[PDB]
Structure 1
Amino acid sequence: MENFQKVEKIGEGTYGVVYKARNKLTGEVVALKKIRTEGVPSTAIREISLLKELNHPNIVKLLDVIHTENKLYLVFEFLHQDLKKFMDASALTGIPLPLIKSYLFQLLQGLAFCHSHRVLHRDLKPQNLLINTEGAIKLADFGLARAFGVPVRTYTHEVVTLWYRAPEILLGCKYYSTAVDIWSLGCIFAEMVTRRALFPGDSEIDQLFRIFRTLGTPDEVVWPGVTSMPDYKPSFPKWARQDFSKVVPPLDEDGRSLLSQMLHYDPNKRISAKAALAHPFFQDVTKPVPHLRL
């Protein structure tokens, strides 16, 4: 776009290259995202436009949608770092619990807002959770999955991670509920605490079986209707559930209680973002300033 000065390539996004750019007219720095091929369907256009109104402090603001020469460019609010990089840079000591709680608290507020408007992310991951020097954290690319389906590989052939994918998705559910985002956030919560990914699957079955080995193979008791799902197989190995005290030490009882509810197999039983915000784990939540060195 002639109105933007591509100052730098930030990285490779799910849909295309993501650039840091400056608007010549306003002078504001933004995140420019190129999306993908035939002419862009009107459905995607209408879906994306609805996102311009989904405004919240914990959601990366969609500034503009530029469709020209049959090409789509999304203009977003720009943040200097993602949670993936921050966790890597805090590996030696791990993110202080107060900051972890603050981030989870803010993330849940963002989900609650989007979910109340029936909008899902469907592909939450450390890579699209952005933070600033003021202690805030925001969800990026919310709603794009519905507009543009999440691919197996990105334009750069990079494999889209399955680490945060909810079990109902892995089992072939055709209709996603807001519960898929709580699952993903639960996995990220566990990762911030232990400093290691919870379920680092490298294939759909490996992902599913890693979940099964930790939470126990799901059955009709804990998940009514699971055996009738598209990709469920009666031949799945039967693993017993591990205690959370072993899965996420040194998370306290409040944190483990909340995580368990965010990781419930049955999407309907899984806690909502709104109910999670009222959980005792957040009784002493604060907003610490993070140590960011840009």
Structure 2
Amino acid sequence: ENFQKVEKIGEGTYGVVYKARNKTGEVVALKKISTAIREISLLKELNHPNIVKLLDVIHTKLYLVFEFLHQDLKKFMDASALTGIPLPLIKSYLFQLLQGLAFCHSHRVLHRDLKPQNLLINTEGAIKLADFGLARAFGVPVVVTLWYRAPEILLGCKYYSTAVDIWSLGCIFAEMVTRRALFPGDSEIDQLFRIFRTLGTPDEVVWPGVTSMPDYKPSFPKWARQDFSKVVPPLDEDGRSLLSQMLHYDPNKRISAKAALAHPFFQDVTKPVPHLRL
């Protein structure tokens, strides 16, 4: 092959990912997985500092070559579990991810499957969106983590909006703050009911049309809503305000990435350097 393998980075949703070096000396992430070939190639001209760079597409099996980053946010949260990620670093990462999402969404690209282990970090303080769930959206063929899935997806919405990524990022924000997953369900209905028990069972008042969702059942239990002071306790009122807007049930009420960037929570945002053990 044109690539000397270094290690298997892991198993994505679409296939294996390897750390490999180009035999240019470049160290890359090599993901293994037409007419979609045209769409995927468009993404390569679209670049943003908070999106992992797609270097090459090769159909011969489908291969995607990405820039390599040494650690993901899931590993960093685990490493930081005794102390917690410092709030200025949580704030910088959230701000950067919202910048990345605002870029994607302005180009009508959804991520669809945001989770800590798809968020890649470097020693310089950057964080970048990786492992986009774009196969289905492009028509590409061939245990799932549901913890970050928006409620309209779980209720069988046929068309996703950009709001699904804001929901996921809100769940990630909460987990960075509390050091524990916000909604750790193990089935679609367990995920849904974990959301309902915390945020209240949605009705037509807070979510017009929810009772017409394909998978909505009138026999859903009716749980009342808790208080965000209980949900992410340490977080100040600016962060709790922003989080509540990223977790609105109604996708139309849920804050956009660009509006979130103007939220007062980010008035004092900085770019700290993380302590990384590689």
TM range (shorter): over 0.9
Q: 1:151 to 1:124 in 2, by over 3 A?
A: farther
Query: What corresponds to 1:210 in structure 2?
Result: 194
Cα distance in 2 for residues equivalent to 1:76 and 1:149: 21
User: Which residues of 2 match residues 1-294 of structure 1 at below 5 A?
Assistant: 2-24=1-23, 26-35=24-33, 42-68=34-60, 71-142=61-132, 144-147=134-137, 159-294=143-278
Conserved 8 A contact 2:111-2:134: yes
Conserved 8 A contact 1:95-1:192: yes
Cα distance in 2 for residues equivalent to 1:194 and 1:133: 23
Q: Deviations over 1:99-140 (max 9, x none)?
A: 000000000000000000000000000010000001000000
Q: 1:32 to 1:209 in 2, by over 3 A?
A: same
Identity %: 100
Conserved 8 A contact 1:125-1:188: yes
Q: 1:231 to 1:267 in 2, by over 3 A?
A: same
Conserved 8 A contact 1:151-1:160: no
Q: Deviations over 1:3-33 (max 9, x none)?
A: 1111111111111111001112x21110000
Cα deviation, residue 48, structure 1: 1.4
**Unaligned regions of 5+ residues in structure 2, if any?**
none
Conserved 8 A contact 1:216-1:241: yes
Q: Deviations over 1:175-226 (max 9, x none)?
A: 0000000000000000000000000000000000000000000000000000
**Unaligned regions of 5+ residues in structure 1, if any?**
36-41, 153-158
Conserved 8 A contact 1:226-1:232: yes
Conserved 8 A contact 2:55-2:67: yes
Conserved 8 A contact 1:14-1:150: no
Instruction: Please provide the CA RMSD for this pair.
Output: 1.5
Q: 1:8 to 1:14 in 2, by over 3 A?
A: same
Conserved 8 A contact 1:82-1:126: yes
Conserved 8 A contact 1:12-1:18: yes
Conserved 8 A contact 2:177-2:235: yes
Worse overlay, 74-83 or 46-55: 46-55
Conserved 8 A contact 1:15-1:34: yes
Secondary structure of the residue aligned to 2:196 is helix
Q: 1:97 to 1:17 in 2, by over 3 A?
A: same
Q: Deviations over 1:43-86 (max 9, x none)?
A: 33222112212210000000000111xx1110001100000000
Q: Deviations over 1:139-193 (max 9, x none)?
A: 00235244467999xxxxxx11000000000000000000000000000000000
Query: Structure 1-normalised TM-score?
Result: 0.92
Q: 1:143 to 1:50 in 2, by over 3 A?
A: farther
